Amino acid sequence: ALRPELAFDHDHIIRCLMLAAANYPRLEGIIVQINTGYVASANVIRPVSEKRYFPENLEQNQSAARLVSAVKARASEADISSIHLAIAREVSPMFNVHELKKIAESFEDPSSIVVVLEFILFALFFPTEFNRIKGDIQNVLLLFFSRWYPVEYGIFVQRGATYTINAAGEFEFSGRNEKWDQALYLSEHFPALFSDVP
Amino acid sequence: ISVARSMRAIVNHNEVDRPRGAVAPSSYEMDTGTLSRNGDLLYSPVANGQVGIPKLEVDHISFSNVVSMMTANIRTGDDMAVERVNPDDVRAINIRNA
Amino acid sequence: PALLRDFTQVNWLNRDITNMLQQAGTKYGLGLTETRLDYVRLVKTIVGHALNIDHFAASVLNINLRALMEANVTADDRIKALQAHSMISTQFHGPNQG
Amino acid sequence: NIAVAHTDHLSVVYATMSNFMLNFTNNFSGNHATFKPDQYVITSPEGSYKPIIERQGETVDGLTIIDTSIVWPILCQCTYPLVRSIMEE
């Protein structure tokens, strides 16, 4: 049944989008605001008053105070808009290269493992956005590994902190430790912690 | 006297083509030239393949010049903000060996 | 003076000025001679205007801006001073103005 | 306790959301080891050059920086329709 309207111009809408992404900063936020609205209408997650961070009654326990402070250090209060934003960011196009909000952790107390877990969970719930910020999280992980596994950290960093895939897909590791910057996300380099190379 | 003089008798005599003793401004007053890569000012080259004579090198005054200036995009000397993060435990802080 | 060209009633003056300006060795200009942009922001940072100014003051001004631009230190380097006056292993974040 | 609400519901939401008209980039390929975003610019011989993706630092929109800690409320402070009498359309 023929709708009497102009055909949707794929080839033109795509160019206008590229042009907007190049020239118009609001675009990212506009597209996100759609997906967020979608998540909001999909009615999939709702923040609740009852935090469930600790087993009963280890929060009451004296020995656990360091670990409990360590978790309360990370446990953001739920806010609907922030969560909807998280889910949405997972599928929305990125235009300005996303930076990790930096973590200070020095990984002395065992409870510092929490930060690692906060990343592992981020890898799971949001593999994509994690992929954007992964070098920046590799900087925290390296502080972890240098403490918890200094010998392994020695061999690993000795292989190199980054690498570049070449023709035929073989990895070429840097052979040199150096801090990742998001300036590298658009470069040929990858953080080496995620190479999955034995 | 009148070492400082640049021009004289900016008027036109009705009989002779220029007033006796009227003096035009030095050409150097008008050669804006170029800012060099070093930030030194240069008069325009007098021939192809010649570099310009730097303005400070010679005693003529030059009343047009290329000043570099920062734009609205730059801003130096503004206060800037940072997040400061205290060490988690004082006893975990190391001094030596650095 | 070079602006008097083809604009002053005094004929000999405008002839002599037009002559000095038509020399290869001298060439007046007024305005935006050059434009250096950021390598990342792509916005203009340091422009170079041809002002009507004495070459001495232009040379002092240029020495100053050169001192600022060639130092290659930014506001971010201030955190090092902070890191000196704050407890050891304190962390400082952002904003990477560059 | 929360896994169903993720994998069996919110995953469907991601799936359809992926097909939205404006989700126009390929964002990830599931391979952290190899994936890099395809990069484009609008370039002209006359010398313009506008990357579509740039690293400009924290923007006013407030979308660039990522607080990973958002993970915590999601795990330990959020009801889902599939997770909580428990019937819910």
Binding site: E77, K101 | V82 | A75, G94 | -
Partner: peptide, 15 residues
Amino acid sequence: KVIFNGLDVNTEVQP
């Protein structure tokens, strides 16, 4: 505590 996507700035270095 609260989620905040921006940098949580809290001091001002002088020039």
